[PDB]
Amino acid sequence: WALTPTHYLTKHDVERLKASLDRPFTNLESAFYSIVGLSSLGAQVPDAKKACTYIRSNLDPSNVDSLFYAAQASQALSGCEISISNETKDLLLAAVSEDSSVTQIYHAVAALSGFGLPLASQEALSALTARLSKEETVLATVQALQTASHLSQQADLRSIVEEIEDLVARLDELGGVYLQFEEGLETTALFVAATYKLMDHVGTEPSIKEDQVIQLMNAIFSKKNFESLSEAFSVASAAAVLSHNRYHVPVVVVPEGSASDTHEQAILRLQVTNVLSQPLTQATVKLEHAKSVASRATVLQKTSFTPVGDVFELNFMNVKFSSGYYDFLVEVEGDNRYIANTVELRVKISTEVGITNVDLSTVDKDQSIAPKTTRVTYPAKAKGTFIADSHQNFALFFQLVDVNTGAELTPHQTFVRLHNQKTGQEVVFVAEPDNKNVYKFELDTSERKIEFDSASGTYTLYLIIGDATLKNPILWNVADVVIKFPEEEAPSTVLSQNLFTPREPE
Amino acid sequence: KTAVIDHHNYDISDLGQHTLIVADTENLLKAPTIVGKSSLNPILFRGVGMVADPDNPLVLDILTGSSTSYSFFPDKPITQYPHAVGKNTLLIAGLQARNNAR
Amino acid sequence: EFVRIDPFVRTFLKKKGGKYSVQFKLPDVYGVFQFKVDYNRLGYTHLYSST
SS (H, E, C) A382-416: CCCCEEEECCEEEEEEEEEEECCCCCECCCCEEEE
Helix, strand, or coil here: A290? strand
Residues in chain C: 51
Residues of A with Cβ-Cβ distance to B82 under 8 angstroms? 430
A422/chain C closest Cα distance in angstroms: 25
SS3 call for A82: coil
| DSSP code for A263 | G
Residue A201 vs residues A96, A121, A196, A437: alpha-carbon distances, Å: 21, 14, 8, 68
CB contact under 8 A, A503 and C28: yes
Closest to C42 (Cβ–Cβ): which among B31, B98, B100? B31
Q: Looking at beta carbons, which residues of chain A come within 8 Å of B30?
A: none
CA distance A17 to A282: 26
The amino acid sitting at B96 is Q
Instruction: State the Cα–Cα distance between residues A173 and A219, nearest whole angstrom.
Output: 9
In chain C, DSSP assigns E strands to: 2-3, 7-9, 14-16, 19-21, 34-37, 49-50
- Cα–chain center distance at A318: 31
Which own/partner pairs from A303-312 qualify as long-range (CB within 8 Å, at least 24 positions apart)? A305/A270, A305/A330, A307/A281, A308/A269, A310/A271, A310/A279, A310/A281, A311/A256, A311/A269, A311/A270, A311/A271, A311/A272, A311/A279, A312/A269, A312/A270, A312/A272, A312/A283, A312/A285
- The beta-strand segments (E) located in A79-215 are 172-173, 179-180
CA distance A202 to A121: 14
Which residues does chain C have within 8 Å of residue B98's beta carbon, measured at their own beta carbons? 46
Residues, chain A: 506
User: In the 8-state DSSP scheme, what is residue B86?
Assistant: G
Q: Do C42 and A503 touch (CB under 8 A)?
A: no
| Among candidates A410, A428, A473 on the partner chain, residue whose Cβ is nearest the Cβ of B7 | A473
φ and ψ at residue B34, rounded to 5 degrees? -80, -55
**Which residues does chain B have within 8 Å of residue A473's beta carbon, measured at their own beta carbons?**
7-8
Beta carbon pairs, A and B, within 8 Å = 47
Q: Which residues of B touch C44 (CB under 8 A)?
A: 33
Residue type, C27: P
CA-closest candidate to residue C47, choices C23, C26, C22, C20: C20
Strand order across the beta sheet in which A386-389 lies: A386-389, A474-484, A457-466, A413-420, A426-430
Residue A69 in 3-state DSSP?
Answer: helix
If we measure between CA atoms, which residue out of A184, A185, A199 comes closest to residue A235? A185
Q: In chain C, how many H helices and how many E strands?
A: 0, 6
Contact B85 A475 (CB under 8 A): no
Q: Please report the resolution in angstroms.
A: 7.6
Tell me whether residues A500 and C42 touch, CB distance under 8 A: yes
- Give the determination technique: cryo-EM
Number of H helices, E strands in chain B: 1, 7
